[PDB]
Design a binder for this molecule. Structure first.
Ligand SMILES: *[C@@H]1O[C@H](CO)[C@@H](O[C@@H]2O[C@H](CO)[C@@H](O[C@@H]3O[C@H](CO[C@H]4O[C@H](CO)[C@@H](O)[C@H](O[C@H]5O[C@H](CO)[C@@H](O)[C@H](O)[C@@H]5O)[C@@H]4O)[C@@H](O)[C@H](O[C@H]4O[C@H](CO)[C@@H](O)[C@H](O)[C@@H]4O)[C@@H]3O)[C@H](O)[C@H]2NC(C)=O)[C@H](O)[C@H]1NC(C)=O
Ligand SMILES: *[C@@H]1O[C@H](CO)[C@@H](O[C@@H]2O[C@H](CO)[C@@H](O[C@@H]3O[C@H](CO)[C@@H](O)[C@H](O)[C@@H]3O)[C@H](O)[C@H]2NC(C)=O)[C@H](O)[C@H]1NC(C)=O
Ligand SMILES: *[C@@H]1O[C@H](CO)[C@@H](O)[C@H](O)[C@H]1NC(C)=O
Ligand SMILES: *[C@@H]1O[C@H](CO)[C@@H](O)[C@H](O)[C@H]1NC(C)=O
Lengths: 332, 117, 50, 117
């Protein structure tokens, strides 16, 4: 390692290198193996319907032009060498905005091997679209994907595959999403046909199951508590008009306020969610409580109060428990 | 996964019913295979809005509509011709597949309904 | 010639040799016709406020 | 600083319970060592517990689960083999260590409960 022979070798690897031409131009296609090391998934936004992903993206191919003899060890060159080499035109099809980290330097790896093999690594943060089905929200289970494709070259010129097969993607255990948990992940390889031709594609899919604890602590519990507060009106004597109507008006106002607060933090989807069904059920329950008091007031003075009051007291908890049981069995 | 069954085979109204993970495969498409001839693209319908695309041969003669309640796609056939004698399939396509006219981009296929009228 | 990467390299170099980017095709001749295709990937959002 | 205590040692169910700053060490991992050879990776489990990893030669024979609150990891071992005789360790790894299969990335180790079959 006199360090001048290395410079000569690297120089004559270049000096006749055309970056405009892929390896084996006009020959068989270049096989580019790919592997990913996931660092984290920072965000999963229902409003924007996308997720942010940070990863180490490693591509691996062979270029006979970059073959050297002599030096029997792998050359870990400076990342700037990547500017003077052909690299695959890989891109993420469903990305919305992505960048390569650039502090302190451009986070790039170039590693050559004596047989012309090239290992090219990047550190990429990317926001990727993920259409979500919120019909069963918040007891929903989403499928998100990252689609890797060649922009310029068809299958006649380039081919993609996963290095190590199912072991190509690592770091799935590193994900720490407070709202979600990754049930499963999958790798797929295929060819997609366009007007211009057939292009390679790789797909990395994740299945995310949402955690229900936050919505138990936020949505369901206040609704149940307000419904019970509505039930409290039945125990008060019938003659207390102000006391008995106050409970009804505050229950319905609180339920509507909960509805607005809940619906003003999600996309304006046109269909009904599970949370909407439960919320409307609780609303009609407090509504029936208020109308029960109104009907009693109409019956007694201004037209048995004890019998109907006792019947309401025994039946309302039973009916609400039955409704909750039916709902929770339906959505679980 | 998705399971497709097509039936209801000159005012033919074919109907393809889909079950399973219909969300992951929004676009649906009708294809035609004549006796001893290559599969060809008849039409395509989007998800939640029914934005439709047609082949040049069958424009303003065949129509496709989406229900989104029974999860069915209806292909209504008008101005029939002798050349419109073939096996008709319905197939589903993923969100990122590219191209409507290419059968290989479609994942799941129906058995196929024969039409001789 | 077929499969000769050096041949393609010198051909492309000759194509770009003496090429003036400042001048359009048929600079002074008839107008250059530019056809256009669009492939829509998505419409991400539609904002009324903006 | 987490202290790990193991237990256990048909089918055999080992359990490893941690006590300390477990939040800073989200990843937990089972390793195995027989005489005359270095300790080898058996499996790994995350903080949420939904993501699990296994060695190549223990697929579908051993299984790992995580019980939070109790703060324990369970390794249930079915259809044991003669080569399975070894000392089993449980170890914790930091948030930014990198590499499940390499024991040097793990800071805190267990006791090494013996298993013989
Ligand atoms: C998240 O959500 C996405 C949304 O779809 C899910 O995506 C799908 O995952 C499945 C995996 O379960 C993917 O299916 C695999 O596709 C590959 C592709 O191979 C292709 O290439 C072959 C040549 O190598 C080619 O022959 C194939 O074509 C054959 O099949 C089609 C359809 O049957 C047929 O029309 C053709 O004529 C061919 O006969 C195809 O072009 C495929 O190889 C896989 O096959 C495995 O499974 C089958 C069935 O068990 C088995 O027979 C095989 O031997 C093999 O074991 C498999 O079908 C699917 O492509 C994904 N969708 C998209 C749009 O890409 C994703 O799974 C979800 N992930 C999670 C974690 O939830
Ligand atoms: C230069 O880079 C090459 C390419 O990565 C290195 O060769 C790779 O080296 C490893 C370590 O020796 C090889 O792994 C070995 O494989 C055998 C058989 O599977 C296994 O029994 C060993 O335990 C070890 O894992 C790997 O095969 C090899 N890659 C090949 C041959 O493609 C090389 O070590 C680097 N250094 C030098 C000085 O070349
Ligand atoms: C190292 O190689 C260079 C190659 O040009 C040569 O000039 C130099 O003398 C060599 N030095 C040693 C110490 O081998
Ligand atoms: C390739 O092109 C170069 C440049 O013209 C020429 O020197 C070389 O002989 C050619 N090789 C073949 C086999 O065509």
């Amino acid at each position: 390692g006199n360090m001048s022979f290395v410079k000569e070798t690297v120089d004559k690897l270049l000096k006749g290198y055309d970056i405009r031409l892929r390896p084996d131009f006009g020959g068989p296609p270049v096989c580019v193996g790919m592997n990913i090391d996931i660092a984290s998934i920072d965000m999963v936004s229902e409003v924007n319907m996308d997720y942010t992903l940070t990863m180490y993206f490693q591509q691996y191919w062979r270029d006979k032009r970059l073959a050297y003899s002599g030096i029997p060890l792998n050359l870990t060159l400076d990342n700037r060498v990547a500017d003077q080499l052909w690299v695959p035109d890989t891109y993420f099809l469903n990305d919305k905005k992505s960048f390569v980290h650039g502090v302190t330097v451009k986070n790039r790896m170039i590693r050559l091997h004596p047989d012309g093999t090239v290992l090219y690594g990047l550190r990429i943060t990317t926001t990727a679209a993920c259409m979500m089905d919120l019909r069963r929200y918040p007891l929903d289970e989403q499928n998100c994907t990252l689609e890797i494709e060649s922009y310029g070259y068809t299958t006649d010129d380039i081919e993609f595959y996963w290095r190590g097969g199912d072991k190509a993607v690592t770091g799935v255990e590193r994900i720490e999403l407070p709202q979600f948990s990754i049930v499963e992940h999958r790798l797929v390889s295929r060819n997609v046909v366009f007007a211009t031709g057939a292009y390679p594609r790789l797909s990395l899919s994740f299945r995310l199951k949402r955690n229900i604890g936050y919505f138990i602590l936020q949505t369901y519990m206040p609704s149940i508590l307000i419904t019970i507060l509505s039930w409290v009106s039945f125990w008060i004597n019938y003659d207390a008009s102000a006391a008995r109507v106050a409970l009804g008006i505050t229950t319905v106002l609180t339920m509507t306020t909960i509805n607005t607060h809940l619906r003003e933090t999600l996309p304006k989807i046109p269909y009904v969610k599970a949370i909407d069904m439960y919320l409307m059920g609780c609303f009609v329950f407090v509504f029936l409580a208020l109308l029960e008091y109104a009907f009693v007031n109409y019956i007694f003075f201004g037209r048995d109060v004890n019998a109907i009051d006792r019947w309401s007291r025994i039946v309302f908890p039973f009916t609400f428990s039955l409704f909750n049981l039916v709902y929770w069995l339906y959505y679980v | 996964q998705v399971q497709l069954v097509e039936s209801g085979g000159g005012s033919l109204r074919l109907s393809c019913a889909a079950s399973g993970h219909t969300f992951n495969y929004p676009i649906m498409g009708w294809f035609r295979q004549a006796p001893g001839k290559e599969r060809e693209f008849v039409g395509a319908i989007s998800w939640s809005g029914g934005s439709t695309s047609y082949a040049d041969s069958v424009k303003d003669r065949f129509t496709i509509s989406r229900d989104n309640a029974k999860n069915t796609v209806y292909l209504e056939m008008n101005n029939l011709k002798p050349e419109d004698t073939a096996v008709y399939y319905c197939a589903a396509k993923g969100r990122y597949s590219g191209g409507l006219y290419y059968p290989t981009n479609y994942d799941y296929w129906g058995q196929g309904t024969q039409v001789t009228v | 010639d077929p499969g000769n990467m050096s041949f393609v390299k010198e051909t492309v170099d000759k194509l770009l040799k003496g090429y003036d980017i400042r001048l359009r095709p048929d600079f002074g001749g008839p107008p250059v016709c530019v056809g256009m295709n669009i492939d829509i990937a998505s419409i991400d959002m539609v904002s009324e406020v903006n």
